[PDB]
Design an enzyme around this catalytic site. Structure first.
Site, PDB file in Angstrom:
ATOM      1  N   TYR A  27      -9.340   2.770  -1.812  1.00 58.42           N
ATOM      2  CA  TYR A  27      -9.999   3.246  -3.011  1.00 58.42           C
ATOM      3  C   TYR A  27     -11.343   3.880  -2.743  1.00 58.42           C
ATOM      4  CZ  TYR A  27      -6.653   0.676  -6.054  1.00 58.42           C
ATOM      5  OH  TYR A  27      -5.557   0.171  -6.748  1.00 58.42           O
ATOM      6  N   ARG A  46       1.620  -6.017  -7.758  1.00 59.18           N
ATOM      7  CA  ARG A  46       0.847  -7.174  -7.347  1.00 59.18           C
ATOM      8  C   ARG A  46       0.458  -8.096  -8.487  1.00 59.18           C
ATOM      9  NH1 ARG A  46      -2.715  -2.828  -4.429  1.00 59.18           N
ATOM     10  NH2 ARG A  46      -1.693  -2.788  -2.357  1.00 59.18           N
ATOM     11  N   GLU A  92      -0.542  -1.810  -7.798  1.00 53.78           N
ATOM     12  CA  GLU A  92      -1.320  -2.853  -8.461  1.00 53.78           C
ATOM     13  C   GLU A  92      -0.490  -3.546  -9.522  1.00 53.78           C
ATOM     14  OE1 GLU A  92      -3.826  -3.959  -7.099  1.00 53.78           O
ATOM     15  OE2 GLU A  92      -5.178  -2.332  -6.381  1.00 53.78           O
ATOM     16  N   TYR A 120       0.816  -1.213   0.000  1.00 52.52           N
ATOM     17  CA  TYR A 120       0.000   0.000   0.000  1.00 52.52           C
ATOM     18  C   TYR A 120       0.830   1.234   0.000  1.00 52.52           C
ATOM     19  CZ  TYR A 120      -4.760  -1.802   0.789  1.00 52.52           C
ATOM     20  OH  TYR A 120      -5.989  -2.430   0.656  1.00 52.52           O
TER      21      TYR A 120
HETATM   22  N1  LIG Z   1      -3.255   3.859  -0.579  1.00 52.41           N
HETATM   23  C1  LIG Z   1      -3.545   2.687  -1.174  1.00 52.41           C
HETATM   24  N2  LIG Z   1      -2.536   1.907  -1.599  1.00 52.41           N
HETATM   25  C2  LIG Z   1      -2.889   0.761  -2.154  1.00 52.41           C
HETATM   26  O1  LIG Z   1      -1.988  -0.037  -2.603  1.00 52.41           O
HETATM   27  C3  LIG Z   1      -4.244   0.276  -2.253  1.00 52.41           C
HETATM   28  N3  LIG Z   1      -4.605  -0.929  -2.847  1.00 52.41           N
HETATM   29  C4  LIG Z   1      -5.888  -1.314  -2.772  1.00 52.41           C
HETATM   30  C5  LIG Z   1      -6.889  -0.448  -2.150  1.00 52.41           C
HETATM   31  C6  LIG Z   1      -8.265  -0.877  -2.090  1.00 52.41           C
HETATM   32  O2  LIG Z   1      -8.595  -2.024  -2.419  1.00 52.41           O
HETATM   33  O3  LIG Z   1      -9.099  -0.057  -1.592  1.00 52.41           O
HETATM   34  N4  LIG Z   1      -6.572   0.817  -1.707  1.00 52.41           N
HETATM   35  C7  LIG Z   1      -5.272   1.145  -1.763  1.00 52.41           C
HETATM   36  N5  LIG Z   1      -4.854   2.353  -1.248  1.00 52.41           N
END
Ligand SMILES: Nc1nc(=O)c2ncc(C(=O)O)nc2[nH]1
Length: 258
Positions: free
Chosen positions: A120, A177, A174, A77
């Site tokens: 998100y 990942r 992403e 994240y």
């Molecule tokens: N800040 C952030 N970094 C992420 O990698 C991330 N990856 C996923 C999600 C989510 O599923 O809501 N939110 C994120 N927010």
């Protein structure tokens, strides 16, 4: 005593330079000593020392501006960023995370924690748009870097800051990942295109935790029940085995094995 830094620039970016960038991110996110059904696992949060907890991603653009993101190695994240003499962090989900982020950017003159979290759903609300309506590609990334850079000076409106974080998260975290998402960004770069992520991308992003769990509890790779993903056209289809995901998912959040 210094978190590892991976650099990328949008200036003159190519398929190869972005591939090299993502490859390097993945190699700093995890040692790859823990692998399940051939898919690497990120380090377990439990017991991870703070000096191993983050990596830094320095982004520069053609406009000659640089910002540095901080990523949590346990989940890739984005937790916050620095631009010169200011750093900003998403509101932490717990006191331990609030303490851990005090070890980021320690020399910065000005630190701030946003009122909002960084997931998100909250970012999309702040942006006034969903992921499906926010374009990705080199052009979006170059603009996001500039928007993050100007935020401390009052020059960037909040919905554009949140749009700009949504772009960075998908094009860095992403893509790390999922090789599939890395490939979607490579295609945009190859053809100098900018376009929103299609349903296949969105549903893989939304499914990461669920897929990490299903692979790690699998019977010799067979999922305990089918998982529904989306094709590019929005149609649902089932996946039954980790084998089909080997070229798709690159990293997993840690789960204990069965
Ligand atoms: N800040 C952030 N970094 C992420 O990698 C991330 N990856 C996923 C999600 C989510 O599923 O809501 N939110 C994120 N927010």
């Amino acid at each position: 005593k210094q978190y590892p830094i991976i650099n990328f620039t949008t200036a003159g970016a190519t398929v190869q330079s972005y591939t090299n960038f993502i490859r390097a991110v993945r190699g700093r996110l995890t040692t790859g000593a823990d692998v399940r059904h051939e898919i690497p696992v990120l380090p377990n949060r439990v017991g991870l020392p703070i000096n191993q907890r983050f990596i830094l991603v320095e982004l520069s653009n053609h406009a000659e501006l640089s910002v540095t993101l901080a990523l949590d190695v346990t989940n890739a994240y984005v937790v916050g960023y620095r631009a010169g003499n200011s750093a900003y962090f998403f509101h932490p989900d717990n006191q331990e995370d609030a303490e851990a982020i005090t070890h980021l950017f320690t020399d910065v003159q000005n630190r701030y924690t946003f009122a909002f979290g960084g997931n998100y759903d909250r970012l999309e609300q702040l942006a006034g748009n969903l992921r499906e309506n926010i374009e990705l590609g080199n052009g979006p990334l170059e603009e996001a870097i500039s928007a993050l850079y100007y935020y401390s000076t009052g020059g960037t409106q909040l919905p554009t800051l949140a749009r700009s974080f949504i772009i960075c998260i998908q094009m860095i975290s992403e893509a790390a990942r999922f090789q599939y998402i890395e490939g979607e960004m490579r295609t945009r770069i190859r053809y100098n295109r900018r376009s929103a992520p299609d349903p296949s991308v969105i549903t893989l992003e939304n499914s990461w935790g669920r897929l990490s769990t299903a692979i790690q509890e699998s019977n010799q790779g067979a999922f305990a029940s089918p998982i529904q993903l989306q094709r590019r056209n929005g149609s649902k289809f089932s996946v039954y085995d980790v084998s089909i995901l080997i070229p798709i998912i690159a990293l997993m959040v840690y789960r204990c094995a069965p």
